[PDB]
Design an enzyme around this catalytic site. Structure first.
Site, PDB file in Angstrom:
ATOM      1  CD  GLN A   6      67.917  19.641  60.178  1.00  0.00           C
ATOM      2  OE1 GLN A   6      68.668  21.574  59.828  1.00  0.00           O
ATOM      3  NE2 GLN A   6      69.083  19.509  60.409  1.00  0.00           N
ATOM      4  N   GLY A  15      61.608  13.695  62.678  1.00  0.00           N
ATOM      5  CA  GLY A  15      61.303  12.743  61.402  1.00  0.00           C
ATOM      6  C   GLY A  15      61.191  11.782  61.699  1.00  0.00           C
ATOM      7  CB  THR A  32      73.338  11.524  56.761  1.00  0.00           C
ATOM      8  OG1 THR A  32      72.281  10.807  56.507  1.00  0.00           O
ATOM      9  CG2 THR A  32      73.509  12.585  55.939  1.00  0.00           C
ATOM     10  CD  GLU A  78      41.291   7.534  40.404  1.00  0.00           C
ATOM     11  OE1 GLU A  78      41.398   7.073  39.903  1.00  0.00           O
ATOM     12  OE2 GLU A  78      40.906   9.003  40.307  1.00  0.00           O
TER      13      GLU A  78
HETATM   14  N1  GTP Z   1      67.596  15.775  50.663  1.00  0.00           N
HETATM   15  C1  GTP Z   1      67.554  15.509  52.024  1.00  0.00           C
HETATM   16  N2  GTP Z   1      67.934  14.823  53.729  1.00  0.00           N
HETATM   17  C2  GTP Z   1      67.900  15.654  54.390  1.00  0.00           C
HETATM   18  C3  GTP Z   1      67.910  16.664  54.245  1.00  0.00           C
HETATM   19  N3  GTP Z   1      67.802  17.134  55.997  1.00  0.00           N
HETATM   20  C4  GTP Z   1      68.403  16.120  56.653  1.00  0.00           C
HETATM   21  N4  GTP Z   1      68.641  14.980  55.760  1.00  0.00           N
HETATM   22  C5  GTP Z   1      67.936  13.610  55.485  1.00  0.00           C
HETATM   23  O1  GTP Z   1      67.304  13.002  57.205  1.00  0.00           O
HETATM   24  C6  GTP Z   1      68.646  12.474  58.322  1.00  0.00           C
HETATM   25  C7  GTP Z   1      67.717  12.981  59.334  1.00  0.00           C
HETATM   26  O2  GTP Z   1      67.889  14.530  59.103  1.00  0.00           O
HETATM   27  P1  GTP Z   1      67.581  15.179  60.889  1.00  0.00           P
HETATM   28  O3  GTP Z   1      68.343  16.835  60.767  1.00  0.00           O
HETATM   29  O4  GTP Z   1      68.418  14.189  62.008  1.00  0.00           O
HETATM   30  O5  GTP Z   1      66.116  15.321  61.430  1.00  0.00           O
HETATM   31  P2  GTP Z   1      65.279  15.462  62.540  1.00  0.00           P
HETATM   32  O6  GTP Z   1      64.345  14.662  62.401  1.00  0.00           O
HETATM   33  O7  GTP Z   1      65.156  17.029  62.263  1.00  0.00           O
HETATM   34  O8  GTP Z   1      67.086  14.852  63.998  1.00  0.00           O
HETATM   35  P3  GTP Z   1      66.274  15.289  64.748  1.00  0.00           P
HETATM   36  O9  GTP Z   1      66.990  17.235  64.947  1.00  0.00           O
HETATM   37  O10 GTP Z   1      67.200  14.617  66.035  1.00  0.00           O
HETATM   38  O11 GTP Z   1      64.844  15.267  65.526  1.00  0.00           O
HETATM   39  C8  GTP Z   1      69.638  12.916  58.044  1.00  0.00           C
HETATM   40  O12 GTP Z   1      70.996  11.807  58.470  1.00  0.00           O
HETATM   41  C9  GTP Z   1      69.527  13.427  56.153  1.00  0.00           C
HETATM   42  O13 GTP Z   1      69.895  11.674  55.941  1.00  0.00           O
HETATM   43  C10 GTP Z   1      67.717  17.827  53.837  1.00  0.00           C
HETATM   44  O14 GTP Z   1      66.932  18.583  53.174  1.00  0.00           O
HETATM   45  N5  GTP Z   1      67.270  17.000  52.505  1.00  0.00           N
HETATM   46 MG    MG Z   2      65.514  17.439  64.246  1.00  0.00          MG
END
Ligand code: GTP
Ligand code: MG
Ligand code: GDP
Lengths: 451, 445
Positions: free
Chosen positions: A11, A146, A179, A254
């Site tokens: 996400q 992620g 988070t 690079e």
């Molecule tokens: N800067 C930023 N950080 C984000 C954003 N969305 C999520 N995060 C960070 O990324 C972490 C993981 O987000 P998740 O929603 O768990 O990402 P995911 O990889 O989709 O995890 P699953 O849904 O379990 O697959 C969060 O706990 C935040 O620290 C965003 O749009 N911007």
């Molecule tokens: Mg996810």
């Protein structure tokens, strides 16, 4: 001529993906369905938008991209939004069920459902590129997908595209902000995979980037939307010489030494300048000296660790807009004088420099400083050690009580596999330490070379 | 796509679901017949997570109605929204549980359950991608505890990879609803503790407190409580139902919320809960919300969480808000109120954020907390099971139903093993000592 590819996983990846493709379509004057409504080409020229956009049909151009989470809803919003017509729909892959912040789902039991789909779409993407340079990748490094899937993807590119530039950009966990709870475990399980495969890894941080937004940019309560549009200025800037002409360029082949002082340490910090409000740029004017000195200030880095606690090793500076090398070269001299900056003894030639002609394209409504002449800075420092040393201790705290271990085991990892990751994390700790000396002796620095 | 199955067991559970299905239906703007004319496409585009689309533009909920009596069902069929339900999903007895778990779980429900499992199968196959199995019921009575166990048992066998969740009502500390409430609340849990991924501990005494003290209700009633309860059930799902800056489903919350595989019994809570008499004298901000999230008194469960330490917490915010304002407020509470938290779980927080606010508010926050202080339930009920069992009260009602007192003894033994596991992780140090032994041999040579 040549191509980068663009990968958003999980996400944060995805959300940042609505941000960086928005910026790329400002910076090139591409409208939300792929048309270039003010095109001027002779055809078959340069015209470097073709490094990031595949031309389709009558003059639809198409982002060189792929997206996934294993939750539908986050990719459904790209499928429905302002730029829904920008994407080719087979870019926008999804799953049945999120990886639930367990890496194990993203790398095994759910990730296997989408991988050879994911790769087939990329095969198709690279089969269309004329001289693929590499892959630039946003991902939720501490997340479920992620974490697990990006690292499953890395392992599954590396067997086919091992000679391409494999570059990635995390979001990293933060010294006081949190988070999620298992954020550290996934952080280690993914570092422990992508250390074998990635050619660089560009760490950036929410808790850091908020403070810069409430200080510098003077944004009162920043959003994740604000944030992704700021974070977008690193990849924008390190692509400026893949998108416009300059007096000095780089390519992807690079950064993987000029930011990688020795291979295990492929972990630089980054920032971008000046980063101030309208009212501030109205009030007061900045020069290319001042804006090089601001990139070395503790309060100005997109990761929370103070550069002073460590030492610099490798630096890339990327100048955009109305600037000349005769000023720029003396402004690095500045940073070469002030001993409040310390580089390592191994790196007396520590600066790499590039200079593109195109100014940053001014955002909608003109909500940013009206500065024709902005700079990105990216550096590898030993100060990151003090940001890992919290994370590897957060593992040691939870794993002593086996806290949450049972979901990882639940999807098919064994206690052997979290212990093996943790001992390479105590090895990473040792690889930050091999430069913790002046010594030249032939396994850290070479006795037959002179800098 | 990701599609939850709801069940509503006994009189209590049925009436929480009967409120649930006015309340989420209203949030999705649904017409009391199962039609729609409502103002947003987004509202209808996502609904499927709790609905099925019957022919000619119509909407049915993924709800199963479960009861061993002709009573409470007759009122759902006459009430607000009584028409949305598939008439087939009412599968019902002519006997009751009699306030007795073993009559639910080894007699009257045991005779009916395969006729109810046949609806569970058919709804699970009519799902796109089956996400979970939620139950409204109680643990202190006979029907929702007893029948609901027997369902959970049979469904947890069939569907081992899906989440298995229980929005339970539980016996209150000082005055009772039924006299056998500590037997009921032991024998049901002696199934649920290794047959759920999530379960809730809802103390109607604290809802009666929050209804007079915060909400400032003059005559507070089930009408109120089942709103407060159902707000929390639609509120935890807002990061699956709808878009936002942090989407997060129930299992993504649960992996962060459960450290060790029996520590899954949660403290619920909502903000804001300011009365109609006070709205104009309070602001609706993330500081004000996060204040009422962690106020003891606002706790929809048995105890102040400061009879313990938070293992874990999760905050599911709703409406348009600065993630930075949220993140700062969750960082302030961890560092000003650090004594409230377990120290070897380094940071205890999961955060999620939906774009969509609930009806009639600027913003809200749903809260799931896990504190070791939930032993205040289990110290009571194991004692109160013992106090009656020790003189053998009420026992022939249950051993008339295919019980032996070895299952009563085995179960109060399991509840001691549970409250002792919950204490084992209470006040445990973030540091673990080394030795004072010495390397090599010791001489001045
Ligand atoms: N800067 C930023 N950080 C984000 C954003 N969305 C999520 N995060 C960070 O990324 C972490 C993981 O987000 P998740 O929603 O768990 O990402 P995911 O990889 O989709 O995890 P699953 O849904 O379990 O697959 C969060 O706990 C935040 O620290 C965003 O749009 N911007
Ligand atoms: Mg996810
Ligand atoms: N929150 C809530 N609690 C209820 C409601 N109706 C009953 N209760 C409680 O829930 C329990 C009864 O659950 P139920 O399964 O219907 O039991 P039975 O009547 O003994 O078969 C008792 O502890 C009641 O006080 C209600 O509508 N809402």
């Amino acid at each position: 001529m040549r191509e980068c590819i663009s990968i958003h996983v999980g996400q944060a990846g995805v959300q940042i993906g609505n941000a960086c493709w928005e910026l790329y379509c400002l910076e090139h004057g591409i409208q939300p369905d792929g048309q270039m409504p003010s095109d001027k080409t002779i055809g078959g020229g340069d015209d470097s938008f073709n490094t990031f956009f595949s031309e389709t049909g009558a003059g639809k151009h198409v982002p060189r991209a792929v997206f996934v989470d294993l939750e539908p809803t986050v990719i459904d919003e790209v499928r429905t939004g302002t730029y829904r017509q920008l994407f080719h729909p087979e870019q926008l892959i999804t799953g049945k069920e999120d990886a639930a912040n367990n890496y194990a789902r993203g790398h095994y039991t759910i990730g296997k459902e989408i991988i050879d789909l994911v790769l087939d779409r990329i095969r198709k993407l690279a089969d269309q590129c004329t001289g693929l340079q590499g892959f630039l990748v946003f991902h939720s490094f501490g997340g479920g997908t992620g974490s697990g899937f990006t690292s499953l993807l890395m392992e599954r590119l590396s067997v086919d595209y091992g000679k391409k530039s494999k570059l990635e950009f995390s979001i990293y966990p933060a010294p006081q902000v949190s988070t999620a709870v298992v954020e550290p475990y996934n952080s280690i399980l993914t570092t422990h995979t992508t250390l074998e495969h990635s050619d660089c890894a560009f760490m950036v941080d929410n808790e850091a980037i908020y403070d810069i937004c409430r200080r510098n940019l003077d944004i009162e309560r920043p959003t994740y939307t604000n944030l992704n549009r700021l974070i977008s200025q690193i990849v924008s800037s390190i692509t400026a010489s893949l998108r416009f002409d300059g007096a000095l360029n780089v390519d992807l082949t690079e950064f993987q030494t000029n930011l990688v002082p020795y291979p295990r340490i492929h972990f630089p910090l980054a920032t971008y300048a000046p980063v101030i409000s309208a009212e501030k740029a109205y009030h007061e004017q900045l020069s290319v000296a001042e804006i090089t000195n601001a990139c070395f200030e503790p309060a100005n880095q997109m990761v929370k660790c103070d550069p002073r606690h460590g030492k610099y090793m490798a630096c890339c500076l990327l100048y955009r807009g109305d600037v000349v090398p005769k000023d720029v070269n003396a402004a690095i001299a500045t940073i070469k004088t002030k001993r409040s900056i310390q580089f390592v003894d191994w790196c007396p030639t520590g600066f790499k420099v590039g200079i593109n002609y195109q100014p940053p394209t001014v955002v909608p409504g003109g909500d940013l400083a009206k500065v024709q002449r902005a700079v990105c800075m990216l550096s590898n420092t030993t100060a990151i050690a003090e940001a890992w040393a919290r994370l590897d201790h957060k593992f040691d705290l939870m794993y002593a009580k086996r806290a949450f271990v049972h979901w990882y085991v639940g999807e098919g990892m064994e206690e052997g596999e979290f212990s093996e990751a943790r001992e390479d994390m105590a090895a990473l700790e040792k690889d930050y330490e091999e430069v913790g000396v002046d010594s030249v002796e032939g396994e850290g620095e070479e006795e037959g070379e002179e800098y | 796509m990701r599609e939850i199955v709801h069940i509503q067991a006994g009189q209590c559970g049925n009436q929480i679901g009967a409120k649930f299905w006015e309340v989420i239906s209203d949030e999705h703007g649904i017409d009391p017949t199962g039609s729609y004319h409502g103002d947003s496409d987004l509202q209808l585009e996502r609904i499927n997570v709790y609905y099925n689309e019957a022919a000619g533009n119509k909407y049915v909920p993924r709800a199963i109605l479960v009861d061993l009596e002709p009573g409470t069902m007759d009122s759902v069929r006459s009430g607000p929204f009584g028409q949305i339900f598939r008439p087939d999903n009412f599968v019902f007895g002519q006997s009751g549980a009699g306030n007795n778990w073993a009559k639910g779980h080894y007699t009257e429900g045991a005779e009916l359950v395969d006729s109810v499992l046949d609806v569970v199968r058919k709804e699970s196959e009519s799902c796109d991608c089956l996400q979970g199995f939620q139950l409204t019921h109680s643990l202190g009575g006979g029907t929702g505890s007893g029948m609901g166990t027997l369902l959970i048992s049979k469904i947890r066998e069939e569907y081992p990879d899906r989440i298995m969740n229980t929005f339970s009502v539980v016996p209150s500390p000082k005055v009772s609803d039924t006299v056998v409430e500590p037997y009921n609340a032991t024998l049901s849990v002696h199934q649920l503790v290794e047959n759920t991924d999530e379960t809730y501990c809802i103390d109607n005494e604290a809802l009666y407190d929050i209804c007079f003290r915060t909400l400032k209700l003059t005559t507070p009633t089930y009408g109120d409580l089942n709103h407060l309860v159902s707000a929390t059930m639609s509120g935890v799902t807002t990061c699956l139902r709808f878009p936002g800056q942090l989407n997060a489903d129930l299992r993504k919350l649960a992996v962060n919320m459960v450290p060790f595989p029996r520590l899954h019994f949660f403290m619920p809570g909502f903000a804001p809960l300011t009365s109609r008499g006070s709205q104009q004298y309070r602001a609706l901000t993330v500081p004000e919300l996060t204040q009422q999230m962690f106020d003891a008194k606002n706790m929809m469960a048995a105890c102040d969480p400061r009879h313990g330490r938070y293992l874990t917490v999760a905050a599911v915010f709703r409406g348009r808000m600065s993630m930075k304002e949220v993140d700062e407020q969750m960082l302030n509470v961890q560092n000003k109120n650090s004594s409230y938290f377990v120290e070897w779980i380094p940071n205890n927080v999961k955060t999620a954020v939906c774009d969509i606010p609930p009806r009639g508010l600027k913003m809200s926050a749903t809260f799931i907390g896990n504190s070791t202080a939930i032993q205040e339930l289990f110290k009571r009920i194991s004692e109160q099971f013992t106090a009656m069992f020790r003189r053998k009260a009420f026992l022939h009602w249950y051993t008339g139903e295919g019980m032996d007192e070895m299952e009563f003894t085995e179960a109060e033994s399991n509840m001691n093993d549970l409250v002792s596991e919950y204490q084992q992780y209470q006040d445990a140090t973030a540091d673990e000592q080394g030795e004072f032994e010495e390397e090599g041999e010791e001489d001045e040579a």
